[PDB]
């Protein structure tokens, strides 16, 4: 019994009631008035790995697997009055963050206005080191290296909220300060503060020609707060214990090479770490290195220091030519861009890692842990076959030996191979 | 080997093959058609939190502190054939829902055929009070008032489904009522029950121009079902206990005023609330103050009824001379627009809040409680800068007083600041 | 003290510096570029649920209840340099996929540049049976058949990775086949690898002209792995137990009609499952109807193989004559799109499911299972309201009679009655 009378609709145009507008996709969607006012964009990246490793990779030594995304980020960033922007990127493969407290990778609001000063606010990982200052959609090797893994609290979030003011400087050097508090509480409730530093000297700055040396710095207070320090690297096997899907469960050997999983308040008050960053690039060859070492500092008497260094080394070539990108904001790598589109550009490279550990607080041989200093030396070779600016498929073998360490079957060495299939929008 | 044609491509159009699109960003995204038949608008709100706080707000007195997002929506929404719209709404700190339920901050289908009837269906909060009906972007004071906390079952949405009629009458008045299932079962598997009715008076009801005068009313029926009757207010400091981030853990004192955290089925059964609204702007001056009282009614002759009462009244002013938006769909107050682009606008608030807790359950004394009514004060004393439309700025002072309920150290009053960094989009 | 010059800024126009783009909203947002190199989709699914049910689905046989989402996709899918697709599907509710390993209903990427044959890869749906292949947004009846619920496993990621070639073959036929490694280790940390293959010729493929036969075979590999083997049918009602909100909680009876929560290691090899699919449609008129059979095969002396057979019927008529769309692509039926813009199309269906489960390890009577064979049978009988191509609002009446399990209460029949309001977008 519903009637109504029919209508002539224009249609065909899209048009918008504010500044011109520019509209782009690929894959994605980026939304912007052309004055620079207002922006919009909605990306993401989704990494699918494969793995199967064996040796001190897994407790028995037999062979395990892996099938989980590394990472499966929203991403939704965008610009107000010219001057303000956000940044929220979320993990779905939940690999990032926490259930407690959200599953971000970054919850940020930079304030631009001071350029080329920025000054940036929420959670979002402090700034110590080239590899990690690159984005995880462009490092060259399936996993970050494991010098950063003797002290992963200089350049991740841990849960907390930051400030932090950076410029680039003169067009020849970049530099940032931070300070954050992370989430763990002394005594009386108040979080672990912690201060980071990073300058850069990048004199040559552009994609196939860099020359970068720098200097990080971190530092955090622990007094009278409980934590766990142990350092309980994965050599560059993400899927002997990882989130996001299927892993190496119970036969997973992400081994403790120092420290303990519940420190008690009081233990240890001064934590820093100083690093060292290198990197050099002429045309499709790449060389980069970092070295860093951690100072854990006892504060009650019957706790032992405990300190770490380690460093990786990386060479990289673009077989069919194309250069790694490069910013200086940021002072760091980013992608490399295919030029032949019918066989996309292919990659190959092979990082060097060493780590030391040197824990006196260990007096005792266990079954696997023999008293004295720990080490372990990674070899990581592989390729990346940069389909297009969206698909990169990437292939690995990755090899560890160890020192004063084994697994249950005594093995002080082990391999694996990884795939990753990345599409980035 | 692979070869293909080369092609000529038309480029820089944006063109539709319905009815004429008109697009918006402000940092987000809006597209609809001109007829109204359709549209999409994404959206969110990102609240970053700092707090410092001592006294009553920790078990010991000492100093804590808090680092977390209050909430971190990601916003969309829509219509379709004119009168069907959706609303999903989900926050990413998770601190609205739950791991189990989904993370909803709302999760709607509203039907305005009827309009200007409405019918709502999904998980959503009821309609009880002001300034619970207010956009959590433009509450005032950092975090609602204390006399919501007698009872927050009254307009939260406990993670379950709800059907909600809602008009306005005649452009002066605003009247809704609902009933929902929330999620807590009897011994059948039979979900809790609740009605809620509100109806507002507001005669004036624009920015700067605003009388408005409302009651409200909530029931549920807690018959044969085991239920968590505490009353545990945190009186304007979230820090002290929080998801999202950082907060004061074993230190944070968000203490039970009365109830118990396992009351049995069968203990209670009806639980009702009445409410009065009261609100006036002339300019940028407003007060507003709401009043509401709570009886829970015991069931089994074992157990005596918990009664609760209290209020809070707000004076707001903007210095710069801007009005706090005010809708009559809805019957709340919103956001205030700067209108000077160079310092934005910049708000002073005073809230007062006023609670007290009747549980003559409570026979004997505690090391922290005392037998007889349990009592806050509360004040809010604060700064809220509109940097523009998107970004707030905020700083407050905040202090209880209580009565017959201490923390640990004996102290009945605390206080603490709070800043928050808000970025909506 | 700020001040500038002012501008005349362009306003009105939208357009992009690529190739001409093509933007829609039917309540979410598509935009493509004209040449089909590019594209983003986004949209989504609501499913609200409320149901009452009594007797076998509870555990005493009085009146549950349930208040839930039964669904809330975020879905985020694109183009990218023509052959490249992504689909990303998450789930808000929480009902599909995990806290460990992410929400996600579908995270895969697809190679398309093969057409007709497509290589898709990632977390994603193994394709077995035609009402699993057809879109949750329009399976006919409220959940999907019993006869899936024997070995749920034929068709679900179990948080796993996969690879999946699948083709339409000379527009009379599809294929798929996949491997796939779902998320339960060995004792050596290697997981549960399973192959799939569906075959389906369907001569006529088009909506209202319909014929299609089809098999089906899954095959996983249990060597040394501990597993959850019961066998668990909600029969038609997702409240007895689900997430996304309320349900039956204590009194819900989702019972074990056969194996047990931890079969241990060494206890079972080989699971294999064949299964039949057909269908018809003639016009608005459609019949269906798919029969599995499961054997679950001893590896160790001490158990027996425990076997299961399924199957169900569907008819379904489109009152106001309009036809389900069908999809050669996939072999699936999909939506109805109403022809009458006032009153919508309505749509009643009738459902029967048979189910026998033979559990020879089941030596000794419980209190409400008898040795033997466990046998079910449901009816599902209900209207489909598509108001229009967005809103489907849904009411059936669910029906169960069982041999040799009884709730507590003794009951060998319930019945209950489901209603859904969807949003799509």
Redo the contacts between chains.
């Keep these: 019994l519903?009637?109504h009378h029919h209508?002539h609709?224009?249609?065909?145009?899209?048009?918008?009631?504010?500044?011109?507008?520019?509209?782009?996709?690929?894959?994605?969607?980026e939304?912007?008035?052309?004055?620079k006012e207002?922006?919009?964009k909605?990306g993401?990246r989704?990494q699918?790995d494969?793995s199967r490793f064996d040796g001190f990779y897994?407790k028995?030594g037999?062979?395990?697997?892996?099938?989980?995304?590394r990472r499966?980020y929203?991403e939704?960033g965008?610009?107000?009055?010219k001057d303000?922007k956000?940044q929220?990127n979320?993990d779905?493969?939940?690999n990032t963050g926490s259930?407690?407290?959200?599953?971000?990778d970054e919850?940020s609001?930079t304030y631009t206005g001071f350029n080329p000063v920025n000054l940036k606010?929420?959670?979002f990982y402090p700034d110590f080191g080239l590899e990690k200052a690159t984005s995880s959609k462009w490092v060259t090797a399936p996993e970050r290296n494991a010098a950063y893994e003797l002290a992963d609290w200089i350049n991740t979030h841990q849960?907390?909220?930051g400030a932090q003011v950076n410029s680039t400087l003169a067009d020849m050097a970049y530099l940032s300060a931070g300070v954050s508090?992370?989430?763990?509480?002394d005594?009386?409730?108040?979080?672990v503060k912690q201060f980071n530093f990073r300058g850069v000297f990048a004199p040559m700055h552009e994609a196939g020609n860099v020359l970068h040396v720098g200097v990080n710095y971190a530092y955090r207070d622990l007094d009278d707060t409980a934590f766990d320090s142990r350092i309980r690297p994965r050599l560059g096997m993400r899927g002997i214990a990882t989130?996001?899907?299927?892993?190496?469960?119970?036969?997973?050997n992400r081994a403790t090479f120092g420290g303990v999983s519940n420190s008690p308040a009081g233990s240890y008050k001064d934590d820093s770490v100083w690093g060292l960053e290198g990197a050099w690039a002429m045309g499709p060859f790449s060389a980069q290195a970092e070295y860093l070492a951690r100072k854990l500092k006892a504060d009650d008497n019957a706790y032992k220091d405990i300190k770490a260094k380690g460093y990786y080394a990386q060479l990289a070539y673009t077989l069919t030519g194309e250069s790694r990108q490069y910013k200086l904001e940021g002072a760091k790598f980013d992608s490399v861009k295919p030029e032949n589109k019918?066989?996309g550009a292919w990659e190959v490279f092979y990082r060097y890692d060493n780590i030391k550990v040197e824990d006196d607080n260990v007096v005792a041989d266990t079954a696997t842990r023999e008293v004295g200093d720990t080490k372990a030396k990674a070899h990581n070779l592989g390729v990346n076959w940069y389909?297009?600016?969206?698909?990169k498929i990437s292939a690995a073998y990755v090899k560890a030996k160890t020192d004063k360490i084994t697994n249950n079957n005594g093995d002080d060495d082990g391999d694996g191979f990884v795939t990753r299939?990345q599409?980035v929008?």
């Design positions: 519903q009637h209508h609709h224009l249609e065909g145009t899209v048009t918008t009631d504010g500044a011109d507008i520019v509209i782009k996709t690929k894959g994605g969607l939304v912007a008035t052309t004055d207002f922006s919009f909605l993401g989704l699918a494969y897994t028995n037999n062979t395990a697997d892996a099938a989980y995304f499966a929203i939704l965008g610009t107000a009055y303000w956000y929220i979320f779905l493969s939940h259930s407690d407290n959200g599953y971000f919850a609001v606010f929420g959670r849960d907390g909220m508090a992370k989430d763990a509480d005594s009386d409730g108040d979080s989130s996001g899907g299927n892993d190496a469960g119970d036969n997973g019918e066989i389909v297009n600016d969206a698909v299939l599409y929008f």
